[model samples]
Target chain A: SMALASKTAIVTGAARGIGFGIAQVLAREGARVIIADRDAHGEAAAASLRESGAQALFISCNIAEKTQVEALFSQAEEAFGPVDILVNNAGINRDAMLHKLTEADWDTVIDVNLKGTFLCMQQAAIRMRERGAGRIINIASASWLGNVGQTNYSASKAGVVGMTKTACRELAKKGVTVNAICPGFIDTDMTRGVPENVWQIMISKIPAGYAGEAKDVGECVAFLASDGARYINGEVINVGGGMVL
Target chain B: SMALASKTAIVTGAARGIGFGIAQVLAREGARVIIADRDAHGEAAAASLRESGAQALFISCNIAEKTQVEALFSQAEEAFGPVDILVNNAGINRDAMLHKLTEADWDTVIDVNLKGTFLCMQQAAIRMRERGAGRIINIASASWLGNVGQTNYSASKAGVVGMTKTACRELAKKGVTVNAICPGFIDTDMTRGVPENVWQIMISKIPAGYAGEAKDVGECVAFLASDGARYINGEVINVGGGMVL
Candidate 1:
């Protein structure tokens, strides 16, 4: 059952939500996992993994910061050998209409969501190319296409898509596969914050008539990281319950 | 000068709009083209192609009718040769919210959009598989992800996606490549019908600050049909100008 046995994975922003869900799935598949997040709760997340009999480590790092991101992979390699997979799952949204959006709000979302993914991908590609084998999964959003009040957030996620494609083309021949998972309205604390009326309107639009669970995203990430998906490259899988058909 | 020289191509619904754009591109690339459409205007469309020194044939086809679809491929073969490329671009949308959507509306959209595409794909796949080479490009829509008051339209486009993926997996080993293109708010006859207020709202969401042109989708279809995109299979390319990032 441990298909990923002997593999080491680095999952950023794994303290909770979809990030944590991906980390748990990878660890359960027999990979030694690192739970990296700025949240202090990552410590407990790692401990929980260890309690479940999987090798796990916690590293508190702000992925948007270059110094911290550099240290993340270095420490992971020191603890668990060469990293086999890197999942860039940390993202932030500052929603507002373009007219009401501030420069600061735009910078914050772009820095963390788009630039952060780029930094980690560069670091992972450098190492993965050397070993000639690796998997890089960037968590994008279905909103990258466009959303009414998510100008900044949408731009950042859209940048991730272009980045994923460019990286996939460059790294594919080198034995490193780069892909993105665009999750639709997943049930999470973030979505729970939406007003009830807004949430209902959102649900009404979905063919599934409900938001997706974090585990649905986790399962997709696991499959992409697996051997079965080897032929798939430079692709964006929408785990949006047919929302973004 | 002709990239697709010696190849035969079919563009369904090629009499007007995006389908016409795709047919123009394919013909420009030196492929012998079949313009299959129910519109009588297809006669002029094919005549214009012939005037440009490109091989062209117009076949009247109501793609929703099984007999017509079968005759379409047969006539295409009789006029040109074995189809090297098949572009399933015929689709109709009957938009309405789930609560207001009628059974007739749902069935009509599904029959012409989803079922029509399936029939064309099946016919093309048979010949392509026998020849051990082919390209199938299905024109889907950004609205497939789900849109307000588009239950029927969304479901039909979503079905095209599933069909694209399933066919890709089944035919890849047989040397057939299957892919889909999702176009965003393109400046077309269909979008011209959108109310002014609704149009403004749509533009606000697009990062490009405007709707795309039919040529944009056409260029993408041309590339997918070419040998340059051979390595890309079972993939969905969004030509939405970062709308659906």
Candidate 2:
């Protein structure tokens, strides 16, 4: 229970997929959790968590807008009493070959994956730096290293990697620890859409020899947000098993 | 001579410092080298290479502009046939704490480091992918891990790392290889500016027990660009001598 015990946390995109998995893990660690997602399904998700004896609430948010992100933080503080942990877990992929990539496609990915990340981190950094205590976890991706037909996705996620690093240096002196979890080939609804033939090809490339669970990434997030990782700052941990290496 | 003999190569920002070091090494490898920079001093640097019995030319251009970048590639091909290698070494640091950072400062670094890199990579990718053979080396920095008082620098450099990965995937199957070299503290005119007292503190942080030479980075770039690294696609090698660990 010492793993984030009594902490108040906010996780974006927690209505489903990897985001929900992360919220489930954080709540189990004795933290009061707020599920921040634009999706209406988050209410049921939060209720599901409450039934499991965890204090959880769902808040609709579009993290891209600065006003919304600021309001999200204010409401989270109002409900949970000063958010101590921020998990940036929301993202989207618009996959296409670089040559055929349209501006709209690239901009859409950057707006959410990069710009939205910046907005959330800004709000988190401002509050955390003032309090001189906080933990911010950015869920980046293994694709930040580059993936075929995902020029837009790779760039923005990598942008997250960069932003988190900058925030780490800026906030660490004031006791805010920033880090990124690069998830690779995790088993999620989105990834499940891939056909088995191509899926096995992707799986064959992993040195770990299998796809990782969303809970695997959640466990790492839980650890990094806990007191145990106080000494770690601006660090990157890949939940992709050995895919990054 | 065995490293990159008879290869056509271009090294950007080769007027001085780490860039110059990379040019000298590539020249010694029996490559027809183009030292691309906006600075007039690049003429003398290329002349210095010629004196050492290398086929070298100086190209004056700003990489941030698409026109100049396209012209650079065209002139490079004219000078030494198809471009077999490209070394993106152009970058600038605009240091400031995040709170104190100005818009101009961040934009300047990103325009040159990130956008310039993307432009150069695009030109290279077009030619390399079509020709079915090429090599690209991006000179990122260890600060991409997140450094104090360098939000802009860290962001752009980490962006370079991301761009290189994306390029690796898109062009790899077409006989192109892309990789990044993250240099830590090296003994260059830049590092020489740091005073001894504060400098050793930086040195102590490096597990290598000392700073590195620019030549160390060049050697790694040479290897990655050579036939020896054929199977090495989208790899990120730190020339920081374990400083990142």
Best by DockQ: 2
DockQ for each model: 0.02, 0.44
Query: lDDT per residue, candidate 1, A81-189, as tens digits?
Result: 9999999999988889999999999999999999999999999999998898889999998888898889999999999999988887677667676789888777874
Each model's fnat? 0.00, 0.61
Give the per-residue lDDT of model 1 (tens digit) for B40-130: 9999989989998889999999999989999999888977879899999998878888999999999999999999999999999988888
Q: How well does candidate 1 match the true structure, expressed as C-alpha RMSD?
A: 15.3
For model 1, the TM-score of its B chain against the native B chain is: 0.95
**CA lDDT, candidate 1, residue A84:** 92
